[model samples]
Target: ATFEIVNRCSYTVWAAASKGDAALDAGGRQLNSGESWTINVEPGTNGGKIWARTDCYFDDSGSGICKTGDCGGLLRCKRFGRPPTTLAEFSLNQYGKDYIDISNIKGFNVPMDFSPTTRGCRGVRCAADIVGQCPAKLKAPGGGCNDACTVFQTSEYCCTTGKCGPTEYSRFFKRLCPDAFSYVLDKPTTVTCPGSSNYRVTFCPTA
Candidate 1:
């Protein structure tokens, strides 16, 4: 499958990729407004994830930091972003189907659209203005939305042990992004479909 990472925002976005459901062509690329980066994935790939880092300052040395979603202080991230990042996750041909979701369980720094290139699979989007409406308690000091777990760090919010459910804080995110995974045990957050060959991941889709 081919994954097209698009930047629709007014400003530039540094896109990062890492292994998720499958091995990825893991790397980092700067995408100007309306520009895109595409990664082709072979069938039977396991897991994949993509995210954007904003307000970054990278030099010719490829060393710098991002105001949000900085991945280990590197332009090419070998890991996930630090925090306050909106994530696009996918797993193809796993369990005989495709699994995909937009997760705010960690947090949100931007709006996103995760869709299939063709009609065989359905798409999921979390294009709400979450940054503007983020709760005061869950607002990132650096300018983004924080997840309940990130803010509270409690078993109730983290839901690490057992089959926990959503809290008021998680519900808040759900109200804005009904299709995204607001919390750890957000069962309905995932979309299962088949016969998808290519996908598109857009950052700041409304911009």
Candidate 2:
């Protein structure tokens, strides 16, 4: 079977290899997109493996994105979970290049839990400082500003008081500080897609 792929990114990217599929590598540079490639695959190669179909959309860095919709499938929020053996992760280095291997797969949507474990709160960014001078301590429960916020933008989300909602430095605190900066001795948290999260893939190999 033949499959086409797209490289969607700001900077140039290289297509890396993955399980069950092959073809195209660096220095095969794809400039900021509108590129496509067709690859031949053995029927039923997936064997239930979740692969890329659209270079699966990802967000551009420094876009000040906090929610999933902001990034959606257009950015790097591809489906991820399980062992790397059955999946071809969205590739890239710090430069965010085309190295992501979204090439050679069937039709995109693979209904799995790609909701992303950690909210891309600052995946592209380490500190929230650059985004918008995030507040030091955003209140969590008491509706007004008690100690629930530690990031940037709009009405703080209070799972405690229940969504007065998005008001500057009022972002989802659980998402920002997994430990809420409460226990200085607590271990850092981890994030990923939910088994229940949707994974509808689409193969859009450029226009």
Candidate 3:
């Protein structure tokens, strides 16, 4: 399968993808507005994620920090980076189907569109003005918006005890991006697409 990461934002962004211990596109790359990168994935790859980092500064050796989604301060991510960023998640060829979703559980940084490029499968998008509308307590330090769970770390928002439900914070995200996973138990967001389908994850997508 192939995954295309597109940057439609007016500023630069660094894209990163992680699959188990493996990093795609050498962990990440800087993408200017209107630029894009396509990544090829092996079949049966599970628990994969794609996200973008903003306001980053990396040296020639690809080591730097970003305002959002900083992965160990490295341009090449070794694992899932820090949160307060959006995500496009996928599990390909799992039981002959490909599962995909756009999640805001970590929080929201940029607008996103996660869509299949084949089989007439529907896409999921989270392009709401989350950063501007973010609750006062859930706002990140530098930029972006934080999930209530990330800020509060309580059972009601984090579902730590497995008996939690959506709170006003989770509802805040859900009301904006109905297609995104606002909380841990926000089901009915994952979409099953045809196996081997190519997908696109667009940042700051207008359509």
Candidate 4:
């Protein structure tokens, strides 16, 4: 099983803060609202995090829950803190350099959100609870996402921040918003630390 959620952000974002300062780099140029990330879990666990990322920005989401093999939470897999026996495995280059597709697996599924998320689709369903760069394809039985996104293999690594130093947001923003430069993210990065204050920035297209 998998868990998925989306956020209707104010503008176009490309990355999300994982912790401290390092965030998952969402090179995938997604608008305010997107979809197709399946929520995942490790079954019977809690205390984990998921986030939204853009070129150099991040937004840590609130707490979440998980259940027995209920793939929903869409955690950082490494941070989920659960162990798996390789019931199945896939290849690398799964996330497509930069995209959103959540799932639950052994260690990939953090031991958090001890409960299950039965929330329905936003907007078209009961209510519309969108946030950040997430897409609303996890729910909605009739939605086209049932088989739209790719379910990556175990070997595939998250491509949010990549191997570059600090968040691209900080890097490039320094040239302009130097005063807004900060390395501390909203949440904790359970995986590799990009840089003590790794960052990058570019000319704001819309600006």
Q: Which candidate gets the maximum lDDT versus the true structure?
A: 3
Report the number of backbone clashes for model 3.
0
Tell me the whole-model lDDT of each prediction, alpha carbons only: 0.84, 0.25, 0.89, 0.23
lDDT of 3 by residue, 162-181 (tens): 78788899999999999999
In model 2, which runs have C-alpha deviations exceeding 4 angstroms?
20-32, 47-207
Order the candidate numbers by lDDT, best to worst.
3, 1, 2, 4
Q: Which scores better on lDDT, 1 or 4?
A: 1
Better candidate number, 1 or 3, judged by TM-score: 3
Candidate 1 regions with alpha-carbon error over 4 angstroms: 20-23
lDDT string for model 2 (1-207, tens) is 333434432323222223323322211112234454444333323222223322223335412221111122222222221111112333222232211121111111211111122223211111111112323353222111233322232243323344343333323322343322221122332223222221221222221
Could you tally the backbone clashes for each prediction?
A: 6, 32, 0, 59
lDDT of 3: 0.89
Candidate 2 has a TM-score of: 0.24
Ranking by TM-score: 3, 1, 2, 4
Please give each candidate's TM-score.
Answer: 0.92, 0.24, 0.97, 0.23
For this target, which candidate reaches the highest TM-score against the unseen true structure? 3
Better-scoring candidate (TM-score), 2 or 3: 3
- Cα RMSD, each candidate: 1.9, 16.9, 1.2, 18.7
